[PDB]
């Protein structure tokens, strides 16, 4: 998952567990009039990375198999990523993000439990769809850490050029790479790719049709809180995917924010073999517990953030 330049025999630590697969309603949706509806299978993979008994770093993202008959819809959703910043780097994150995503990404060993009404077995093609927003907030994991002396504060534009490098290195070969930059124009979205030959603007899902039935609704996404709004508001059987990204551009999240982009890569086709990689799983319950601790540390004390790390280290 991590190379050993990274893990000096010990002075580092990764914590890395996934939820046991777990069926839910389709964050595209799907007609009722559908012929052939998927089954969606949600997977949380949470990874922080250690530094003796402090964390250093977080990785948040969530796999969505839309399991057809003969093959696999697979989106990948980056939920979150920070640093804590307690002590002085020495690392380039990217090298520990990249990996792990890619890994996340490449995961096949999942332990899905037939559909009701012994585990199911995967079909072979398998379509990624790798989905990643940017928008420099200041805690997306670790809260109160925007006061730690050695934290690096993003701005919207060198974020987004950080997660184009990391994308780039780990999506080679993949179909497409589209970056949209809602409310910028052509030419200022353009030149975050310019030296990037596989990048385009655009985004990668139906560009047709109503804007519900093509963009995924994902949570806590910029993206998806406008989606959101287009069903509770009852506008989802008019507003098209064209119409969707032309009015996501005004919202505040947006039009107020500093450079937040949208980022999509695809590769089609792909056959997969299954293969079991015995990693810590959980139940929703026992992750969003985790989740729920983590939320009120101070990253700001090493007594609390050594504190976290010692009470986990106990549960396991």
């Given at each position: 998952m991590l190379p050993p330049d990274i893990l000096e025999n010990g002075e580092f630590e990764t914590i890395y567990f996934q939820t046991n697969p777990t069926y839910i309603k389709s964050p595209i949706h799907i007609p009722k009039s559908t012929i052939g509806k998927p089954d969606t299978v949600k997977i949380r993979h949470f990874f922080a990375l250690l530094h003796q008994d402090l964390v250093?770093?977080?990785?948040?993202?969530?796999?969505?198999?839309?399991?057809?008959?003969?093959?696999?819809?697979?989106?990948?959703?980056?939920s979150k990523c920070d640093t804590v910043g307690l002590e002085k780097s020495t690392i380039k994150w990217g090298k520990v993000i990249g990996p792990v995503l890619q890994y996340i990404i490449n995961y096949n060993g999942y332990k899905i439990k037939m559909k009701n009404?012994?585990?199911?077995?995967?079909?072979?093609?398998?379509?990624?769809?790798?989905?990643?927003?940017?928008?420099?907030?200041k805690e997306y994991l670790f809260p109160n850490s925007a006061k730690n002396p050695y934290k690096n504060l993003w701005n919207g534009q060198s974020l987004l050029r950080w997660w184009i490098s990391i994308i780039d290195s780990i999506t080679?070969?993949?179909?497409?790479?589209?970056?949209?930059?809602?409310?910028?124009?052509?030419?200022?979205?353009?030149?975050?790719?310019?030296?990037?030959?596989?990048?385009?603007?655009?985004?990668?899902?139906?560009?047709?049709?109503?804007?519900?039935?093509?963009?995924?609704?994902?949570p806590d996404d910029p993206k998806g809180r406008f989606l959101?709004?287009?069903?509770?508001?009852?506008?989802?059987?008019?507003?098209?995917?064209?119409?969707?990204?032309?009015?996501?551009?005004?919202?505040?999240?947006?039009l107020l924010g500093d450079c937040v982009s949208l980022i999509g890569c695809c590769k089609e086709n792909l056959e997969?073999?299954?293969?079991?990689?015995?990693?810590?799983?959980?139940?929703?319950?026992?992750?969003?517990?985790?989740?729920?601790?983590?939320?009120?540390?101070?990253?700001?004390d090493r007594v609390?953030?050594?504190?976290?790390?010692?009470?986990?280290?106990?549960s396991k």
């Open positions: 250093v770093l977080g990785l948040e993202v969530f796999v969505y198999l839309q399991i057809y008959s003969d093959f696999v819809e697979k989106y990948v959703y980056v009404l012994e585990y199911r077995t995967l079909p072979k093609t398998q379509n990624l769809r790798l989905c990643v927003f940017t928008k420099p907030a080679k070969g993949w179909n497409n790479h589209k970056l949209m930059i809602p409310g910028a124009d052509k030419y200022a979205t353009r030149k975050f790719i310019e030296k990037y030959s596989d990048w385009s603007e655009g985004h990668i899902f139906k560009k047709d049709g109503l804007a519900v039935q093509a963009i995924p609704l994902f959101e709004l287009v069903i509770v508001e009852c506008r989802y059987g008019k507003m098209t995917v064209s119409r969707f990204y032309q009015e996501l551009a005004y919202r505040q999240e947006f997969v073999t299954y293969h079991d990689d015995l990693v810590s799983t959980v139940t929703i319950s026992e992750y969003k517990e985790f989740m729920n601790l983590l939320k009120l540390v101070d990253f700001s609390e953030v050594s504190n976290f790390v010692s009470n986990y280290r106990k």
